[PDB]
């Protein structure tokens, strides 16, 4: 993850194309968030 | 073919091409009439 | 890191006020992804002093 | 791409296969046909109507040139064009400032780089029309070029 | 579904009206809800062709060409729609309609055919003798001998293998208006028979302090419903010109038509009747509960605009409000949607000159009320 | 090899095993009063016959994604992968959607299917995918 904030991020700006990639694979792969923030998991960031 | 579609939606909304849409269009339609003028030689004696 | 991470793939101020379509639906991902109110529950814990 | 189709009408008998093949990808396209058909034969009329007289009638600078509303009225009188068809030379016309149009250049600026895909149109469509008649989809294409 | 699609031929999953023979007559179903409990299937001619009760759709059983070209003698279901009731073959008469619970391949299962005789199908002169699959009955009117019997023929269907003079059909499509209409009918006419069976399992009993007395009840589901109702029947907008209001005038004052003869006015009648007899949403939580208290004000006041809606620009409608004028005006003087009552009395009174000749001094009184 | 092409009626079916049994559902929606879409099974249609009234379904359009985008922003054609459709309710007329409600409880990121009665919004528009690799 920082890894990708450090794709996604520069100079106190969002580069748009790197984010839109960025967020459709994260979202492709729901396992990624781990098990909050997942349907199956049943919990939230609260619960994490 | 696709990818040439794809660009003239890219431009359809657009007024004018700017330069570097001229010259990506002149770069693949060059290609293209390569393409074209091989598939055309490979029929051109009566090859049924 | 994650929540870091999906702040700083949030669109920029203008371009949602442009109404960009890909930007505005990538913040309606990230506010389906992240409630609201796990962000304020997660500041109200505190730390330990 | 015309000239390849051509290739493929090579060594054709009458009805072929390959004929009848090429009329229907014609007629499953049929619009986009339509539009380029239009848009060689607009140009040709265009031609024409600049070198008829009435147009010179209508023509009254000195330096040349026609304004923008009676090159609108002129071209109506001649009740050749619909009004898209109108509005569509009027875009593509020059539009100088102070509707300023050089209806010689104007007429002759799509005349030499659309006369060899316009004469390799003519030749497919008269090499599928003499190679699958008595087709009742193809006759209307020929009368629209 | 559509496998083959040819223009002016029967094809599967396509609703329309099965007139036997002449154009006369055509395959009815029980005048009323209760006349024969929806379930007697008769051979009725007359105005009843315009109606929705004359509408059968061909599902193709066979799930393999489903909605595909109906071929000759194929097992297939016949469908009311307007009930959802599978026509079938019955043990206890010759054939009836059944519920879908009901309905098996074993009793659904029809075919057309070519002749009477043992040893494709177009819309214009199919003359096809239709025949059950499972058994070998066949389908003939019971030619019934107006006192003795009524004008219309109502003969009534039988599945016996005897051959009679006439066992030929005609299958008339019917318009997408129609069939729309007749589908909303079904649903709306279901929701609302459960809605009602509702009222009855909490009618009268308290709540207390637990649950309410029967189950959960649709409130969301018949707000949308009521909603997108009343936006169906909503009246041509003034600023068209004339040929299109005057159209949309015909085509609105025919749907009216269509869901006033299939009960569904006597229906939302039931309803605002069984909501009355609530007087307050205090009343409603005591016995229904608080949560469908809550929306009972929204409830009753969108059926009298339904009401209003269904009525308005029609006079039959509006005429057979003769036996029922008491009754709108009874409901006058209630606190909740007291503009709703009144318009509902006005489309009445300007659209029936019946119910204005009947109208009583007591009556006036009651207007005379409202406004004091 | 037909092709399924645009303007024509098409029902959506999924096939699942549950308790060993290899249910066939099919989507529906009866649209008015309840936009919300529920699947009724179509297998053991000889015990239980299924509804066809509600579950069929009219291809409108099988625009491409950067047509799609310049559509938003201002036939009987073939489908192909990667195509958005947009798909109409046979009953209802109504252009079947994804709807921002989620009474599924199951998952917070699962949104409810539901149609819809215009199509302006890009709500109703559904990018087709390859299956498998071949």
């Known amino acids: 993850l920082d890894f990708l904030r450090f794709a996604v991020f520069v100079n106190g700006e969002s580069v748009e194309e790197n984010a839109n990639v960025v967020v459709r694979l994260l979202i492709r792969k729901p396992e990624c968030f781990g098990p909050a923030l997942r349907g199956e998991g049943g919990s939230g960031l609260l619960a994490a | 073919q696709e990818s040439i579609s794809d660009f003239y939606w890219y431009y359809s909304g657009k007024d004018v091409i700017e330069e570097q849409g001229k010259r990506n269009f002149s770069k693949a339609m060059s290609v293209a009439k390569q393409v074209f003028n091989s598939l055309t030689e490979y029929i051109q004696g009566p090859c049924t | 890191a994650l929540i870091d991470l999906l702040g700083r793939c949030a669109p920029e101020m203008h371009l949602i006020q442009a109404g960009k379509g890909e930007a505005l639906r990538i913040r309606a991902i990230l506010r389906s992804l992240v409630p609201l109110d796990d962000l304020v529950g997660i500041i109200s814990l505190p730390l330990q002093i | 791409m015309v000239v390849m189709l051509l290739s493929l009408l090579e060594g054709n008998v009458v009805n072929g296969m390959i004929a009848r093949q090429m009329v229907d990808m014609l007629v499953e396209s049929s619009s986009n046909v339509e539009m380029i058909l239009k848009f060689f034969d607009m140009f040709l009329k265009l031609k024409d109507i600049v070198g008829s007289e009435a147009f010179q009638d209508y023509v009254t600078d000195p ?43 104007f007429a002759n600026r799509f005349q030499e780089p659309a006369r060899d895909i316009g004469f390799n149109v003519a030749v497919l469509l008269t090499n599928l029309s003499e190679h699958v008649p008595h087709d009742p989809r193809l006759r209307n294409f020929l009368e629209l070029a | 579904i559509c496998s083959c699609c040819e223009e002016g031929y029967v094809t599967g999953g396509h609703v329309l009206r099965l007139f036997h023979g002449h154009m006369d007559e055509c395959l009815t179903i029980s005048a009323a809800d209760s006349d024969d409990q929806r379930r007697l299937v008769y051979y009725e001619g007359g105005a009843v062709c315009t109606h929705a009760r004359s509408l059968w759709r061909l599902e193709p059983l066979r799930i393999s060409w489903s909605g595909s070209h109906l071929r000759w003698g194929q097992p297939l279901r016949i469908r009311h729609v307007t009930t959802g009731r599978y026509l079938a073959l019955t043990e206890d008469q010759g054939l009836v309609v059944v519920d879908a619970c009901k ?93 009602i069976k509702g009222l009855d399992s909490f009618s009268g009993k308290p709540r207390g302090s637990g649950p309410p007395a029967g189950p959960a009840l649709p409130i969301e589901a018949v707000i949308l419903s009521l909603q997108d109702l009343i936006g169906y029947f909503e009246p041509p907008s003034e600023e068209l010109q004339h040929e299109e209001k005057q159209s949309k005038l015909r085509s609105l004052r025919n749907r009216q038509s269509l869901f006033q003869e299939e009960g ?79 318009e509902v009395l006005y489309c009445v009174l300007i659209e029936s000159p019946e119910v204005l000749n009947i109208i009583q001094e007591n009556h006036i009184k009651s207007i005379i009320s409202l406004l004091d | 090899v037909q092709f399924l092409r645009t303007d024509d009626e098409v029902v959506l079916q999924c096939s699942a095993t549950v308790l060993k049994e290899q249910l066939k559902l099919c989507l529906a929606a009866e649209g008015f009063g309840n936009r919300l879409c529920f699947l009724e099974p179509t297998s053991n249609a000889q015990n239980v016959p299924p509804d066809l009234a509600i579950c069929c379904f009219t291809l409108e359009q099988s625009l491409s994604v950067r047509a799609l985008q310049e559509m938003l922003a201002n036939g009987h054609r073939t489908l192909l992968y990667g195509h958005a459709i947009l798909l109409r309710h046979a009953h209802s007329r109504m252009y079947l959607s994804c709807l921002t409600t989620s009474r599924s409880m199951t998952d917070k990121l699962a949104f409810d299917v539901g149609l819809q009665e215009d199509a302006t919004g890009e709500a109703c528009w559904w990018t087709m995918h390859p299956a498998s690799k071949q």
């Open chain 4, 63 to 105: 330096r040349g040139l026609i304004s923008k509303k009676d090159f609108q009225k002129a071209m109506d009188s001649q009740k050749q064009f619909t009004g898209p068809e109108i509005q569509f030379l009027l875009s593509c016309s020059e539009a100088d400032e102070n509707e300023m149009i050089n209806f010689e250049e």
């Open chain 5, 264 to 342: 569904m006015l006597s229906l939302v009648l039931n309803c605002i009747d069984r909501l009355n007899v609530y007087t307050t949403a205090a009343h409603f939580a005591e016995y229904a509960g608080e949560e469908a208290a809550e929306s009972w004000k929204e409830i009753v006041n969108l059926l009298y605009e339904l009401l209003a809606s269904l009525i308005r620009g029609n006079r039959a409608n509006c005429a057979l409000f003769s036996t029922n004028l008491d009754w709108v005006v009874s409901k006058l003087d209630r606190l909740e949607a007291s503009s709703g009552i009144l």
């Open chain 5, 103 to 195: 309905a098996h391949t074993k009793a659904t299962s029809f075919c057309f055919r070519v002749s009477k005789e043992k040893l494709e199908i177009k819309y214009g002169e199919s003359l096809c003798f239709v025949q059950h699959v499972a058994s070998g009955l066949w389908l003939t009117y019971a030619a019934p001998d107006k006192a003795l019997r009524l004008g219309v023929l109502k003969k009534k269907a039988i599945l016996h293998q005897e051959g009679h003079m006439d066992d030929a059909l005609f299958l008339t499509r019917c318009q997408q208006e129609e069939s729309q209409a007749a589908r909303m009918i079904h649903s709306t006419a279901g929701l609302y028979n459960q809605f």
